[PDB]
């Protein structure tokens, strides 16, 4: 069974880059950058982090992919080999559609 944790965060998007910020358990925060094409905008989201190994998620995440599906947001986390480390399911205040991803990592705050 994967462990479940409350998370919350924000996405801010320019036209060609975006930043994702997620507050997780154990006083850790995820910052990720994605580039490509988006509609400029921003919003908050709240949800659940699912992972079978939180320590490994925080140590080994170097990448994220996301799927924005209206007021649903899915964020998947990966290590440098493309291995899946866990994911977030969240509700987003601001409806957005798109898929993308990029570099990111977890750190203390």
Residue numbers in the entry: 86 to 194
What's the publication's text?
Virulence-associated proteins (Vaps) contribute to the virulence of the pathogen Rhodococcus equi, but their mode of action has remained elusive. All Vaps share a conserved core of about 105 amino acids that folds into a compact eight-stranded antiparallel β-barrel with a unique topology. At the top of the barrel, four loops connect the eight β-strands. The same applies to virulence-associated protein B (VapB), which is also encoded on a virulence plasmid; this plasmid is mostly absent from foal isolates and is predominantly found in porcine R. equi isolates.
Here, we determined the structure of the protease-resistant VapB core in a new crystal form with two molecules in the asymmetric unit. The crystals diffracted to 1.71 Å resolution and the structure was solved by molecular replacement. The same three residues (Asn152, Asn159 and Asn161) from both chains contribute to nitrate binding. In one of them, the loop regions at the top of the barrel adopt a different conformation from other Vap structures. An all-against-all analysis of the available Vap structures using the DALI server revealed that with regard to these loops, chain A of our new VapB structure is most distant from the other Vap structures. Okoko and coworkers suggested that Vap proteins may have functions that only manifest upon the conformational changes that frequently accompany the binding of small molecules to proteins. Our new VapB structure reveals that despite the crossover connections, VapB can form a large cavity between the β3–β4 loop and the β7–β8 loop. The bottom of the large VapB cavity is formed by hydrophobic residues (Val96, Phe105, Phe130, Ala153, Leu158 and Ala177), while its side and mouth contain both hydrophobic (for example Ile124 and Val181) and polar (for example Ser98, Gln103, Thr123, Tyr151 and Ser179) residues. The large cavity in VapB contains 12 ordered water molecules (A311, A314, A320, A322, A332, A344, A357, A360, A380, A390, A401 and A403), giving a hint on the size and shape of a putative ligand.
